[PDB]
Symmetry: C2
Subunit: 152 residues, 2 copies
């Protein structure tokens, strides 16, 4: 990705609160094949830390259960780009957000071969509104997504 | 679906030959979740029978293997609509085909609650041409597809 495709003037403190994963897209089928993929998560909550970092509350499908996992994304030199300092490092890219309604973000795997990428459209409330989905779609044409999910 | 969304003037004898599954879409995520779903098949070949019926050579993911399954779709009173006379009956709807390049078809589950539906874009040769994908996309806007796959 590029620094221009990311958001500009992002205020991490305004993304706080709960969010709902509405749609999912991925560059490689496998990445979201079954409930399988390690990138097949659902953002439940976003909590920024005073030092500017990003705490993310996810939920996964684990052993017929809905597992809660908490991972922290560290602030990098570039805004809207966060790093999940793990054995396998991941970068959380925030593309666009109005803070109030939607929030589009992606997770990129560097270690992998080409560009393992996965994005999510997050809505504040599960309203019968579809501006978020639209914004999502427009923001994904410029990317090679091979799988596309939309949730009930 | 409706008799107008199906093809008109379809010549089953011209669809003979081999085909490749290029893209997949489904009305319900589950239907194509992992290699899982019973509708997660890949058309390898289409062989029409003299009596007008349709023999389909599929391949599935079975026990870490690529299983070959042959099912026959019986000719119904309406053209481009075929029935897979099974315990669980299924209807194979052919939407549009130029016989030479692409072929768009869907599989609908009647027994299910609402409208279990799954469609495939089939190409003759895996060319670097994308008219088929386009035709596929246009033919799916008028349908509630929640999952969308595209193969390497």
């Amino acid at each position: 990705l590029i620094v221009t495709q990311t958001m500009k003037g992002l205020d991490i403190q305004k993304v706080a609160g709960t969010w709902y994963s509405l749609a999912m897209a991925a560059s490689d089928i496998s990445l979201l094949d079954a409930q399988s993929a390690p990138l097949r998560v659902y953002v439940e909550e976003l909590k920024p830390t005073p030092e500017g970092d990003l705490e993310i509350l996810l939920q996964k499908w684990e052993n017929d259960e809905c597992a809660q996992k908490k991972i922290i994304a560290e602030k990098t030199k570039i805004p809207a780009v966060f790093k999940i300092d793990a054995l396998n490092e991941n970068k959380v890219l925030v593309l666009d957000t109005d803070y109030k309604k939607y929030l589009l973000f992606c997770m990129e795997n560097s270690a992998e071969p080409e560009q393992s990428l996965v994005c999510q459209c997050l809505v504040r409330t599960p309203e019968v509104d579809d501006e978020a989905l639209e914004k999502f779609d427009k923001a994904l044409k410029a990317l090679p997504m091979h799988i596309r999910l939309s949730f009930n």
